[PDB]
């Protein structure tokens, strides 16, 4: 066997000379050197080092400044907490997992590090849908009398959380479940092994395709819709407002796709070639990489959106002179509204 596996998991090394041995129980030092697993603990370490402060930042930016409440507002501030969820969650165990060289808490720390990674990256591609529509809505407006309100953003948000969990949450109880992969650092999905005493096969060709596939062919189509209207360059009047947000939530989904296609090419690849020789290597990159879905998003949106940047520039200097080159949103001051 290719292989060596377990009740509970399957690394990617053979066993023909017993060196093999439970990423629950012991240093997978065998697999390869106790530097790149440093490596991956110094990158991980980063990574909280970073995903905290930049989804913490946003957090509190968003909610402080009372007129930030538009869907992408509250997308965002969705995003922040399922990264920051990411954070502790699992990054926590993954960066435990690297410097110990296992799985030292056993199955639960692997499944914090798997769920938490699954329950963030679902939460992110469903906001992009929401997203999608939100934004074919206001661009190709359908609705002759029509504005999404706070009342439809928090359906949204509310939604995204159910679609991450559909896919998230079965793993924990019954249908597939997380098992370490790479160099056994993190936790995903299991491909490896049929295991017919959990139904494997079953819930990847649904994850797959309900948690992959289709949110995908939706946000493509929706896509396909909107190179009309809001055609693609960038620089009433109302219409430069919309169209800019629009490039920022496209980059977002080409920002998603780095993340994550390399990553579930990889999956599926070991999904239909199970027991193969594959190394450990081959899927700590993609996975670990993908890994940076729990903080390049607010960098977009901080980059992109020059009112939140302005706002955060306005929280940090704790009051005000953003540096920027329209409406606006804060507290004590003009945080005032303007309806009709
Ligand atoms: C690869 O093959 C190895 C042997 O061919 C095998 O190692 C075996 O590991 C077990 C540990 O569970 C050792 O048995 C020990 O069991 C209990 C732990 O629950 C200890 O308290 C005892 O002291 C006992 O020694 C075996 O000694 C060891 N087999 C050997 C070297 O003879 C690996 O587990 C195999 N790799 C896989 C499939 O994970
Ligand atoms: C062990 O791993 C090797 C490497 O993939 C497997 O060998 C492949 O076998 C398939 C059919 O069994 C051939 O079509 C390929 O040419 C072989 N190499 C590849 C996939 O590139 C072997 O089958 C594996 N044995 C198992 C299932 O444990
Ligand atoms: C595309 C940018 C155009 C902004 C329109 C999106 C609506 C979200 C912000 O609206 C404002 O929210 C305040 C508090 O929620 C209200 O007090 C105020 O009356 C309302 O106008
Ligand atoms: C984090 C993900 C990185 C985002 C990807 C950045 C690529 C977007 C810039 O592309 C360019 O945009 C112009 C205006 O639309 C087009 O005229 C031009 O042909 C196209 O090449
Ligand atoms: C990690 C996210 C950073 C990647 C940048 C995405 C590439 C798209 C650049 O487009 C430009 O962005 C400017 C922001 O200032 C807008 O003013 C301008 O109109 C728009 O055309
Ligand atoms: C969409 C981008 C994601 C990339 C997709 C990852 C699949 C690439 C893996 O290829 C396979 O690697 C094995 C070695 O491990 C070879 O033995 C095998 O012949 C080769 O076919
Ligand atoms: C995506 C890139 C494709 C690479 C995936 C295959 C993993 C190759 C690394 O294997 C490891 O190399 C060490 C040094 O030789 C050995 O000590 C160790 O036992 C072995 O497991
Ligand atoms: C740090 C540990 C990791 C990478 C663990 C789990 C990740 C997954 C099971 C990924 C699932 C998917 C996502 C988030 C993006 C769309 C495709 C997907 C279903 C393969
Ligand atoms: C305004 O008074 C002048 C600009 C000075 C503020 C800029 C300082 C950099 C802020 C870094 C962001 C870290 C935030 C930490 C979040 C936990
Ligand atoms: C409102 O919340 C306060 C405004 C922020 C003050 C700006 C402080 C930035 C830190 C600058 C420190 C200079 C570096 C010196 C190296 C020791
Ligand atoms: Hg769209
Ligand atoms: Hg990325
Ligand atoms: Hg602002
Ligand atoms: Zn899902
Ligand atoms: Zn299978
Ligand atoms: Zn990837
Ligand atoms: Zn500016």
Not at 38 to 45: E, Q, R, T
Not at 276 to 296: E, L, N, Q, R
Request: hydrophobic share 45%; proline share 6%.
């Amino acid at each position: 066997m290719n292989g060596t596996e377990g009740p509970n998991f399957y690394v990617p090394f053979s066993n023909k000379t017993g060196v093999v041995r439970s990423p629950f129980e012991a240093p997978q030092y065998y697999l390869a050197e106790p530097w790149q697993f440093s490596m991956l603990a110094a990158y991980m370490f980063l990574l909280i080092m970073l995903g905290f402060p930049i989804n913490f930042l946003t957090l509190y930016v968003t909610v402080q400044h009372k007129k930030l409440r538009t869907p992408l507002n509250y997308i965002l501030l969705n995003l922040a907490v399922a990264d920051l969820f990411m954070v502790f969650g699992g990054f926590t165990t993954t960066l435990y997992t690297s410097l110990h060289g296992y799985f030292v808490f056993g199955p639960t720390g692997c499944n914090l590090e798997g769920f938490f990674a699954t329950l963030g990256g679902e939460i992110a591609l469903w906001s992009l849908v929401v997203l999608a529509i939100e934004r074919y809505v206001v661009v190709c407006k359908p609705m002759s009398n029509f504005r999404f309100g706070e009342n439809h953003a928090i359906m949204g948000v509310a939604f995204t959380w159910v679609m991450a969990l559909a896919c998230a949450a079965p793993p924990l109880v019954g249908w597939s479940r997380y098992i370490p992969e790479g160099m056994q650092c993190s936790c995903g999905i299991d491909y490896y092994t049929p295991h017919e005493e959990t139904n494997n096969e079953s819930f990847v060709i649904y994850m797959f395709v309900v948690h992959f596939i289709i949110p995908l062919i939706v946000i493509f189509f929706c896509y396909g819709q909107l190179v009309f209207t809001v055609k693609e360059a960038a620089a009433a009047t109302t219409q430069k407002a919309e169209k800019e947000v629009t490039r920022m939530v496209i980059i977002m989904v080409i920002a998603f796709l780095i993340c994550w296609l390399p990553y579930a090419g990889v999956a599926f690849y070991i999904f239909t070639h199970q027991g193969s020789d594959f190394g450990p290597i081959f899927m700590t990159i993609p996975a670990f990489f993908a890994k940076t879905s729990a903080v390049y998003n607010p960098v977009i949106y901080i980059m992109m959106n020059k009112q939140f940047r302005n706002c955060m520039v306005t929280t940090l200097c704790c009051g005000k002179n953003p540096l920027g080159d329209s409406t606006t949103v804060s507290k004590t001051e003009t945080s005032q509204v303007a309806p009709a």
